Amino acid sequence: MVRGIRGAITVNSDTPTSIIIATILLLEKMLEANGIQSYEELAAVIFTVTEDLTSAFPAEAARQIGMHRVPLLSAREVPVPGSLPRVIRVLALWNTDTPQDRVRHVYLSEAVRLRPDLE
Known part of the structure; x- marks a missing residue:
């Protein structure tokens, strides 16, 4: 069984x-909200960025905190x-x-307004 976790943040x-x-x-x-203390059960992680962000790869940050095997x-x-x-x-x-x-999804900064749970 696989479950997706979504996040979003603005800069x-x-x-x-x-x-x-x-x-x-x-x-x-995203990890702390779902009680995940290890990277071993993440199958993959996909990032998207809007067109106005181009100076760095977001995957770079994931390697920094030790997700080299993910x-x-x-x-x-x-x-x-x-x-x-x-928006990232x-x-x-x-x-x-x-x-x-x-499953707990995490929206931060101005991305709060993208939350699908809001009526």
Whole structure:
């Protein structure tokens, strides 16, 4: 059984340190919210970035905190006019029996407004 975990975070400027710092806090928050203390049961982690972020790869931040053995891949998000700018999104594929409705998803900074749970 595989369960996806979603995260999203915004940054203020397209600079390498900000992109890396934002991604670190997002990943560690996604892990802590779901009680994952080890990287061994992540099948893969996929990142997307909006078009206005280009100075650093978000996967770089994942290697920094020691995910060297976790398969990573990054891509570009769709440039919908008026959409929230400067957003890094994460999809982590987690080997777990945890039910879909019990998995915790993490949205930070201005990305709070993207939460699918809000009515």
